[PDB]
Symmetry: D2
């Protein structure tokens, strides 16, 4: 009888998933409808809808479930992050990449993902903020389907960078990452020992001299390159560089990056 | 374009062969696929469906009820008195489901759900008896596991022996009828007890109700009448049948009235026809 | 603290004997000061108050109506049939305002508003006649006056048709030839105390009151005297009224009700703001 | 033929110069007369106006705030990040009320309420500094009278710090005593000491001040004609410096400041502005 979630919202991207909407809904809705006696299901129609729905329902609902890929999850992130009241968020993975779902240990089988939600295991998750843009997975320069990070990793120029991190300063670089999530491009993060709930972000720079070392590092796929953890980060380049992040964005250097500890609460899989 | 921007589905979890998860697998996905704004509320107690209808009537364009006669009756009593009444649809989740049958709704719950997505809607008359609303019927003289009140009565009418008589005064559209009776029905719906109405030529959307009385003396005549399955007006002393819009029914002593579901209604009764008071999802392939 | 977390004020803009702005200057500020969640809706057409009551019944803890007998009746018909019925209060905005007077509400609208902020609440009986609810009265034989049905009747009674009536009340019967048949719930009729004696709106019972065909002159003198003490008069909970031919019934506002009638009482069906000083 | 089917009035009960009842007698009746669907919510705590704006943004067409600079700032921070942002109006209930003055709103609260009923609306720019939004200003080197009001009252009787300002692909490095980025046309209850600032021109005004004495004389002899206009600004200091803005905030350098052109629509007074 003792649920955490009196009212639930399921946001459905109809274009998400393998094919039939009906088939996808046959897999994900019945378990949710059985478990949650007040369930509201809204389809998105256009880019931005998920963001709008999150903003409208944030104060009316206790759990928001998003069925969609990285892009839809990012819309939800941007929708809830700036709000004072932020209900618990859950992901049913409906893209091909689904990075943050994997960080939470969510099964890629959508029926199982739905079933998981009904178990109501919830944990705090850190949300990053770069010049007012929020992100869950990563921030990166030098990355530029499978997605931006996925394509970069499947197929893996110099510029100077000045990074100010928690009172300390840091060269000529090829790749600069700030990681929050534990998976990137559908596989465990190539940035070592990243945690999404440890109150800190992981800076990761591949140097000018380290191009070959980095190629081998990604291949061997066993991690433990300049790498440091930090809460408050400022990243500067010689000229304005376009930044890549969880989804479509207009962000560019220079950047103040800041970590919001436990900003979201999210459904996760404690078995994994 | 859809007629229904926002939809509410009220689920009685006890409804159906009972298995919630299985039932929801059958009914929800087609609805969720068709209707991009769908709200699903489970009832917990008697009266919840009525409350939900009353809270959502002004917020929603379609209300779907998954339940048996009792839950449908709760919805009837919820929406009927309101000024704004969205369209109502039934997924039949009991064993009887009289009004669903009147609307030609398939008893296969998946197919009932699919029907709703076709959005065929018609006006339906709602009767009002002393402020109680009903869709199927009003009756006196109907009174171990239940086919429903009317269904059980029809199954045992043949082998039930000594029925009690009572006097009745019926005022119908400025005419009066007074006699000793065993059964008095006022029918709105076209099915009673799971089969076509024994009251002849009843229509739920013709702007009028059907009065149907068996005299104290007409027990045998009525048994034969049902067996004959010839639902027409026998020019029969024992059976009185007339159509009327505005009806008042009086008995010597207060008698408990039977209707679509659980109710506290009793005689005397003002019964009133509200023409096209509801709009409801129906099956034009059958009705 | 407060009984009322959320409040709705329904304003009939045509109500009051002064413009909208002046009326709102008198009634809104005290309410806004007292109630930190206040929603104000103006009616535009007949029926709106009914609709607003039905939409907000489940969202709000108090509903205040600023209007005359007609607007109050729209609220009565809006809330009465619902399962959830918040507390109702009246700011008197007509000329008659019968039920506001029953509750002891001052006719000064600023004072009526102030009263609501004191949050004195009592159960009130609501009558039900063939599914029509009423707060004040039900009557037959009441046949450009803005004084209201009863008010106009009382003003012109000085200078009628008889009809037979059969009244069944709580297992007793009364038949006779009559000129006026009233069933009273409220304590004021036509802007003055009820001519039916000792009527109470919260005593769990209704007052039947019949003026016989022989008592026309006696009744005219009785009204002139304005004595209003204990014509056939009895209290009853469950009443059935029959006439020879269908007669049109008069009640709180516009209605299509007619005899024969089952009249029934719903004890404490509403809770309402009242004035315990009066 | 109204622009506003549904209206929300957010009241700070502590706002205004006398009793709440008196204040409500002045502001509510004109609004209630003009707007047939009016919802009035009192704040109880810091943050409530922000929460109310966020809850009602999608339910309402106009949000009126009765309060000072701090309450207005709560509304700014409430609406600015949202996708759907109804029109905002100010009834000035503090002593400073800078942005209300930018919009030409009379300081007489009854007249401010009446203005709203005329429904004159214009786009207004909102600035964004590291995800904090502001309407009036951003600054380093600044009872109270408010941050700017107190600063101006005590300026008669300071520290220097290095600053790097990147503005629309140009750079400015120097040692400074005061750095302002202005959006609003009034600061500290009087016209902006930053010259020719406009809240709706699509651009922000950078204003930096060796110039301690020159600045003291400038404020005294209020002539008002390093100062430049820019849309996209980055401000860096040697060490993290606390930033001052419209109300209470945790903002600090370094800062990306961005202008969002016509981000809000707001009730204004075309007889004055
Ligand atoms: Mg981490
Ligand atoms: Mg019919
Ligand atoms: Mg009484
Ligand atoms: Mg400007």
């Amino acid at each position: 009888t003792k649920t955490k979630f009196e009212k639930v919202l399921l946001i459905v991207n109809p274009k998400a998933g393998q094919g039939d909407l009906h088939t996808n809904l046959t897999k994900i809705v019945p378990p949710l409808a059985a478990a949650f006696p007040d369930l509201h299901i809204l389809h998105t129609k256009e880019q931005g809808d998920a963001t709008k729905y999150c903003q409208e329902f944030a104060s009316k609902v206790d759990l928001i479930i998003v069925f969609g890929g990285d892009g839809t999850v990012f819309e939800c992130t941007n929708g809830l992050a700036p709000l004072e009241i932020r209900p618990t968020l859950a992901i049913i993975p409906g893209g091909t990449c689904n990075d943050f779902s994997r960080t939470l240990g969510v099964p890629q089988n959508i029926a199982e993902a739905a079933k998981l939600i009904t178990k109501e295991h919830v944990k705090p998750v850190d949300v990053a903020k770069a010049n007012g843009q929020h992100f869950l997975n990563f921030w990166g320069i030098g990355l530029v389907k499978l997605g931006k990070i996925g394509y970069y990793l499947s197929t893996i120029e110099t510029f100077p960078v000045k990074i100010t991190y928690d009172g300390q300063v840091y060269d000529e670089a090829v790749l600069v990452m700030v990681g929050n999530g534990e998976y990137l491009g559908g596989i465990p993060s190539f940035i070592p020992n990243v945690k999404c709930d440890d109150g800190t972000l992981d800076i990761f720079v591949v140097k000018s001299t380290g191009i070959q070392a980095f190629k081998d590092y990604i291949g061997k796929k066993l991690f433990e390159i300049f790498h440091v953890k930090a809460k408050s980060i400022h990243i500067e380049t010689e000229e304005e560089k376009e930044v890549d992040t969880d989804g479509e964005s207009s962000l560019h250097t220079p950047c103040q990056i800041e970590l919001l500890q436990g900003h979201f609460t999210m459904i996760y899989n404690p078995a994994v």
